[PDB]
Design an enzyme around this catalytic site. Structure first.
Site, PDB file in Angstrom:
ATOM      1  CD  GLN A   1      -1.303  -0.780   3.582  1.00 55.21           C
ATOM      2  OE1 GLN A   1      -2.536  -0.749   3.525  1.00 55.21           O
ATOM      3  NE2 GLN A   1      -0.652  -1.489   4.496  1.00 55.21           N
TER       4      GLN A   1
ATOM      5  CE1 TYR B   1     -12.281   0.497  14.523  1.00 57.48           C
ATOM      6  CE2 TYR B   1      -9.921   0.516  14.995  1.00 57.48           C
ATOM      7  CZ  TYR B   1     -11.013  -0.057  14.378  1.00 57.48           C
ATOM      8  OH  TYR B   1     -10.836  -1.179  13.607  1.00 57.48           O
TER       9      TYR B   1
ATOM     10  CE1 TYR C   1     -10.550   5.722  10.894  1.00 54.20           C
ATOM     11  CE2 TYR C   1     -11.938   4.676  12.566  1.00 54.20           C
ATOM     12  CZ  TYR C   1     -10.688   4.886  12.004  1.00 54.20           C
ATOM     13  OH  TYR C   1      -9.579   4.260  12.555  1.00 54.20           O
TER      14      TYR C   1
ATOM     15  CG  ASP D   1      -2.745   1.479  14.772  1.00 57.42           C
ATOM     16  OD1 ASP D   1      -3.191   1.885  15.872  1.00 57.42           O
ATOM     17  OD2 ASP D   1      -3.362   0.648  14.046  1.00 57.42           O
TER      18      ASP D   1
ATOM     19  CG  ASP E   1      -7.526  -2.238  14.121  1.00 60.45           C
ATOM     20  OD1 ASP E   1      -8.175  -1.492  13.353  1.00 60.45           O
ATOM     21  OD2 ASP E   1      -6.542  -1.839  14.762  1.00 60.45           O
TER      22      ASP E   1
ATOM     23  CB  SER F   1      -7.292  -1.049   5.898  1.00 59.39           C
ATOM     24  OG  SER F   1      -6.750  -2.161   5.196  1.00 59.39           O
ATOM     25  CG  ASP F   2     -11.967   1.079   4.045  1.00 60.82           C
ATOM     26  OD1 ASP F   2     -12.934   0.933   4.835  1.00 60.82           O
ATOM     27  OD2 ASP F   2     -11.333   2.151   3.952  1.00 60.82           O
TER      28      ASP F   2
END
Ligand SMILES: C[S@@H](CCCN)C[C@H]1O[C@@H](n2cnc3c(N)ncnc32)[C@H](O)[C@@H]1O
Ligand SMILES: C[S@@H](CCCN)C[C@H]1O[C@@H](n2cnc3c(N)ncnc32)[C@H](O)[C@@H]1O
Ligand SMILES: C[C@H]1CC[C@@H](N)CC1
Ligand SMILES: C[C@H]1CC[C@@H](N)CC1
Lengths: 281, 281
Positions: free
Chosen positions: B32, B62, B224, B87, B156, B158-159
């Site tokens: 990415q 979150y 978000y 993260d 957790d 990403s899209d």
């Protein structure tokens, strides 16, 4: 296609944007810049002084929670006042209550009302209702002069910059106090917990100086800054607004899209940092 | 100063923008595009493939809700798995639990971990902890191979566009099923009720095919899309995840900024239109 972008000093360093299908109406009224456009994905959009006031896609979240919170707590409300709310969304939700006998709306800017009657016919349809009485006036003046007192007062104003500037002070909350029945309720639009804690702290200090129970709830609405908006809830009785006193079960309410009996109470359950900020108040 | 703008086909016709103080790091990793910038009002910002993954200002909303929901329901969790979450935000919250003995994290992209260790030292500080074990791998492969089963699995990701594409299917939820203890819990990141109801309906059909209790909660987070994010909650026992089984009262939790005992349950109280959509499932 072009994009509408929502900048403001009230939320510095961030902006929300919508894609424009076509611009429908634009004008400078006596009080504000008015813009109506059709967006590609949120339906039609009312922008006032550059700030998104409503869109067809999510307006029901704010109107239902603003109206049905206090209207389910008030036992048999007869006389209701809406301050601001030119678009008619609140009025639409109020007309579902067969017990309501009168609905006064005090909106400073008639351009807003007329634009809403023309372009937002699913929002402004409550104006057909015979119980509705429209006063074109600064609510600040209106509340100093009204002879009637009210069961509920719903303050559905725009932001503190512009015409709604006269509504974000201690003096205004006294007028709301005096215009309410001995056991009446006020709910007021009260900004976003993510960015406006200073303001929430002020509004709560003003209210607590007068009302037996000040409470804050929060609504998820994607087209307002930070994706949420608070409701400042004021009570003259010790019970408050967190608990519905009825279920909305008649045919009038079969169409509700956000509000229900359970998320009424839930909306009052705030993030930890906010609770920490608002209890030495 | 310039602005970062978050466009995507996953939320067509809308965009959220932040003002850039300075760009800190940019790269094309194996999986990415990675961008870190300091914003003027939201602190530092991690963007992955052009989509905001976290900012310093609201990340705790979150991470706390994703972690402390399941971790307060699990009675004595010993072995926890985080899928994605490079993260370290989840890991940070997990380390507060003295009962936890192991924490495996399976993150496909080590650039994310290293960038977070360098630029987000308040988020990635959980990596210091001796209980943490890092596996650099596609969770989809990892869950087919793991020998251990887990008390909690926190997804957790990403899209669905990009590396997380392998996690949004029926087969993945079977792997989560088989990697959980007989009475274990999964919580998965599950998009926004305002725009992704099709997807929520799918994810729930997949989960219900396997788990005794599938439940959906919702978190207010301004950076978000639509200002909120859902959590898909899966249970192997009939009780589910709506009710905490403990209060977080030790010195480790004194610093919590969003999660508390009361808004745990509240988050499960969904808008009426969403409930209407998800119960013939
Ligand atoms: C359209 S409504 C938008 C929220 C969705 N119901 C906001 C209204 O507040 C009115 N407003 C703002 N200030 C005042 C004052 N001072 N008095 C009355 N009405 C006001 C303003 O003209 C908008 O129509
Ligand atoms: C940084 S985290 C952002 C949310 C705040 N905690 C999103 C992580 O999901 C990882 N991810 C995405 N797909 C996968 C797969 N398939 N496997 C493991 N990890 C993944 C991706 O690399 C991000 O680091
Ligand atoms: C109704 C009000 C309109 C302006 C605010 N920014 C959001 C909510
Ligand atoms: C953690 C995830 C990151 C991408 C999504 N658009 C929001 C929530």
């Amino acid at each position: 296609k072009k994009w509408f972008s929502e900048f403001s000093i009230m939320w510095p360093g961030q902006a929300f944007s919508l894609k424009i299908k076509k611009i429908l109406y634009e004008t400078k009224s006596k009080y504000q810049n008015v813009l109506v456009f059709e967006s590609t994905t949120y339906g039609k959009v009312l922008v006032l002084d550059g700030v998104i006031q409503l869109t067809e896609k999510d307006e029901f979240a704010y109107h239902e929670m603003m109206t049905h919170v206090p209207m389910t707590v008030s036992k048999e409300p007869k006389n209701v006042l809406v301050v601001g709310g030119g678009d008619g969304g609140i009025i639409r939700e109020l007309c579902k209550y067969k017990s309501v006998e009168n609905i006064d709306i005090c909106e400073i800017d008639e351009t807003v009302i007329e634009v809403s009657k023309i372009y937002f016919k699913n929002i402004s349809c409550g104006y057909e209702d015979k119980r509705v009485n429209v006063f074109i006036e600064d609510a600040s003046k209106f509340l100093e002069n009204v002879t009637n007192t009210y069961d509920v007062i719903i303050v559905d104003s725009s932001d503190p910059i512009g015409p709604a500037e006269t509504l974000f002070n201690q003096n205004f909350y006294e007028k709301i106090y005096n215009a309410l029945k001995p056991n009446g309720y006020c709910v007021a639009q009260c900004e976003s917990l993510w960015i406006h804690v200073g303001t929430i702290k002020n509004m709560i200090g003003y209210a607590k100086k007068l009302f037996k129970k000040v409470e804050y709830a929060n609504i998820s609405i994607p087209t307002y800054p930070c994706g949420c908006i608070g409701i400042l809830c004021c009570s003259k009785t010790d019970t408050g607004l967190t608990k519905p006193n009825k279920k909305l079960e008649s045919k009038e309410f079969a169409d509700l899209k956000y509000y229900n009996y359970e998320n009424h109470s839930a909306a009052f359950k705030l993030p930890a940092f906010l609770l920490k900020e608002i209890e030495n108040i």
